[PDB]
């Protein structure tokens, strides 16, 4: 009776694929061929941040384009001032193998995690002045891969245990647990509406998740290897996924299929981080070749290269206003580009 | 200039001083990674060094030199993802149960996978063939030998330079040296000359285990200095 269900699932998958292909009236290229090119988008390093004792693995920008948080595997969270370069805070982490960090939009709390399977929320506006652990929640059976804040009381986190969960800080319990992918989750990306978010896993698939309803509304399988990076489009209708196959694919939710594949023959290294500009024309993806290349979302042509690093670019993020771009690498240097 | 800006610069200088103070200790201590399947006696090795946590930590001191040994406690079977975080460490300790021949193939496969990793291709891999007494007893029993699992054992002879311990049976020596030869031929293959293995025979009660760790770590750091002096 199990083979019956297997064949039924296969038939449903074939039907879904046929319905998806039926809507493939034209490719994004044939529509974006007539548009003018973005041209050589040359960028220069305006600020160089130093002070990290180990590899920089995670960074995130807050609501303001000035403050910046970065995480290193030495057990230190440093709040950097992009304008004056002055260090604002230094948090000694209880776990040195940190792999993710997030800056809440309220500017008061910051979360982090890693191989310890525990997510510690640090308070920056503590009346005592020093940084204190507000809540240290646990429950995941794997390393935390990515964390993102929805509000000052709710946080979504991904773990290597293949399952995601939405946490409530004031109590410290899983509000809703998702079914999970077929492999370890690697990245998270919240939509601008705060109601939807897409997560990538090592099984080369991406699923659209709803915050309130703990279910998957859409699933994508356009990649051919582990997805290491994912970012939502500024409008919340599409998202790009970075994988170790040295190719970045743009997935649209309304179309429900891949529209463009950013790849080059001279690139063989995998993608570690992906980010979109405020307008969406510039796609910034970090490659393992020690260089970060900018891609035209519409033309798919390379608009520039940010080779101001000497090691694997592990994390990168564009400000909410698109004034500057921060690129982090294992070389312990975090440079703020134009 | 603004007074708040000067105060922020002073706070940044203090944070930099604290970061330097922490980096001092970070560079003083050495990091070690302990890998091994459940069948391996890694738990006994960790608990004997009296000298839902996803990661476990153990610290010991050999000849005043501090060592940090990390071991994953609660994680899935896959390893290609979280293994990247343990790079830049002093060395990796791989433990395998040399007695059980069934799980030996999986152990060799895991060792080959960890050795050919693109991100760990610059970290030496320490090899401790634990549980030698059980292997000796099993190969002396004569019921089931390595030949039943590996065909090369039918035409492999003990090397000429094989120095066995006083009172060891020739069969035990030949078996352990065949296992060591398998490990060495798996390691040297695509070794690149930048990282080498350190096979060592140990048991569940040998107190010299930490001494071997220190001895091979002293040599690993030596090679790192030569590549620096030569600008490789």
């Amino acid at each position, epitope marked *: 009776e199990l083979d019956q269900l297997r064949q039924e699932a296969e038939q449903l998958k074939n039907q879904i694929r046929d319905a998806r292909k039926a809507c493939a009236d034209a490719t994004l290229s044939q529509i974006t061929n007539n548009i003018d090119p973005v041209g050589r988008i040359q960028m220069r390093t305006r600020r160089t941040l130093r002070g990290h004792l180990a590899k920089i693995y995670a960074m995130h920008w807050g609501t303001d384009s000035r*403050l910046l948080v970065s995480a290193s595997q030495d057990g230190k969270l440093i709040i950097w001032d992009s304008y004056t370069t002055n260090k604002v805070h230094a948090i000694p982490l209880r776990s040195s193998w940190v792999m993710t960090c997030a800056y809440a939009p309220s500017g008061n709390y910051v979360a982090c995690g890693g191989l310890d399977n525990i997510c510690s929320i640090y308070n920056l506006k503590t009346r005592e*002045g020093n940084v204190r652990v507000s809540r240290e929640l646990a429950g995941h059976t794997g390393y935390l891969s990515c964390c993102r804040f929805l509000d000052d009381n709710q946080i979504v986190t991904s773990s290597g245990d293949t399952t995601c969960a939405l946490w409530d800080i004031e109590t410290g319990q899983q509000t809703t647990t998702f079914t999970g992918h077929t492999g370890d989750v690697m990245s998270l990306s919240l939509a601008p509406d705060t109601r939807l978010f897409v997560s990538g896993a090592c099984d080369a698939s991406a699923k659209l998740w709803d915050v309130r309803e703990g279910m998957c509304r859409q699933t994508f399988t356009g990649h051919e290897s582990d997805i290491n990076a994912i970012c939502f489009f500024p409008n919340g209708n599409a998202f790009a996924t970075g994988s170790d196959d040295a190719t970045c694919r743009l997935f649209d939710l309304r179309a429900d299929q891949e529209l463009m594949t950013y790849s080059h023959d001279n690139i063989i290294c995998g993608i570690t981080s992906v980010s979109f500009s405020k307008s969406g024309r510039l796609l910034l993806a970090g490659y393992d070749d020690f260089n970060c290349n900018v891609w035209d979302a519409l033309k798919a042509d390379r608009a520039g290269v940010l080779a101001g690093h000497d090691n694997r670019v592990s994390c990168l993020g564009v400000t909410d206003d698109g004034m500057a771009v921060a690129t982090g690498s294992w070389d312990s240097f975090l440079k703020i580009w134009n | 200039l*603004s007074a*708040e800006d000067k105060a922020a610069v002073e706070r940044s200088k203090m944070i930099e001083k604290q970061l330097q103070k922490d980096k001092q200790v970070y560079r003083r201590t050495l990091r070690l990674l302990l890998l091994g399947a459940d069948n391996s006696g890694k738990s006994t090795i960790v608990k004997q060094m009296r000298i839902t946590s996803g990661i476990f930590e153990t610290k010991f001191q050999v000849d005043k030199v501090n060592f940090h040994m990390f071991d994953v406690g609660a994680q899935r079977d896959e390893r290609r993802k979280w293994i990247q975080c343990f790079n830049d460490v002093t060395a990796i300790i791989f433990v395998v149960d040399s007695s059980d021949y069934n799980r030996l193939q999986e152990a060799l496969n895991d060792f080959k996978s960890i050795w050919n990793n693109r991100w760990l291709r610059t970290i030496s891999v320490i090899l401790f063939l634990n549980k030698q007494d059980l292997l000796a007893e099993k190969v002396l029993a004569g019921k089931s030998k390595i030949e039943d699992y590996f065909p090369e054992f039918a035409r492999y002879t003990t090397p000429e330079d094989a120095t066995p311990e006083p009172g060891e049976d020739p069969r035990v020596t030949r078996a352990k040296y065949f296992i060591r030869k398998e490990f060495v031929d798996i390691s040297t293959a695509s070794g690149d000359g930048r990282h080498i293995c350190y096979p060592h025979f140990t048991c569940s009660v040998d107190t010299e285990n930490a001494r071997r760790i220190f001895n091979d770590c002293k040599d690993i750091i030596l090679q790192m200095n030569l590549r620096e002096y030569n600008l490789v």
Partner: single-chain antibody, 230 residues
């Protein structure tokens, strides 16, 4: 968080005295200490300043050479050694903590202070000194300065302190940006030269004196102080 001062009392002319302050409930080293004096029935006046880790120290041109500030981090205690005490030194000294960084709130907690009795830069001048008002009406305290506090970076270095009968000055605004622990009734506006503290609804807890202060340059100077009665 508490700042209990000690060492006050009566002193003769030319003598000395060591005013101590016990800090608790926070990282004393992380916060810079500020000694502020208040003459009897008069306004505030900055005295000295010591940064974190004793890396920087400043004194007022009127007290330079006489007073010296020191802080013992191991015990989380502050000390102020005074020399050549003059008759004018009769005043109540207050110890204030302040942490400086983007988004902070310097001068957030004011200690109880201690009473001690004997025997060219920017200046803050307030045009109003008393404003009679009854419940239901609003208040708008004005402030004038001789130099535009709008630094090149665009930050408005304006600080308001409300001292109530028996209590120490409480921080209301540190930069339009309302301070913590104070209702939203208080609001600030104005340009780099002129400033205005507007309160929408006046409650029975606003009775006191409102003091203005600039922070563009380290040497501080408080204003005459505007008093509200109700």
């Amino acid at each position: 968080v508490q700042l209990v001062e000690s060492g006050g009392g009566l002193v003769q002319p030319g003598g000395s005295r060591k005013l101590s302050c016990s800090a608790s409930g926070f990282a004393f080293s992380s916060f810079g200490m500020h000694w502020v004096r208040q003459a009897p029935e008069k306004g505030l006046e900055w005295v000295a300043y010591i940064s974190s880790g004793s890396g920087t120290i400043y004194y007022a041109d009127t007290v330079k050479g006489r007073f010296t500030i020191s802080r013992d981090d191991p015990k989380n205690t502050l000390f102020l050694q005074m020399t050549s005490l003059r008759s004018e030194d009769t005043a109540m000294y207050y110890c204030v903590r302040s942490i400086y960084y983007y988004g902070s709130s310097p001068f957030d907690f004011w200690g109880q202070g201690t009473t001690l009795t004997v025997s060219a830069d920017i200046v803050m001048t307030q045009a109003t000194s008393s404003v009679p008002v009854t419940p239901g009406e609003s208040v708008s305290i004005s402030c004038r300065s001789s130099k535009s506090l709008l630094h090149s970076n665009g930050n408005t270095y304006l600080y308001w302190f409300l001292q109530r009968p028996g209590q120490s000055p409480q921080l209301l605004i540190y930069r339009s940006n309302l301070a913590s622990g104070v209702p939203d009734r208080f609001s600030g506006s104005g340009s780099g030269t002129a400033f205005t503290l507007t309160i929408s609804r006046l409650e029975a807890e606003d009775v006191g004196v409102y003091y203005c202060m600039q922070h563009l340059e380290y040497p501080l100077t408080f204003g005459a102080g505007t008093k509200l009665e109700l």
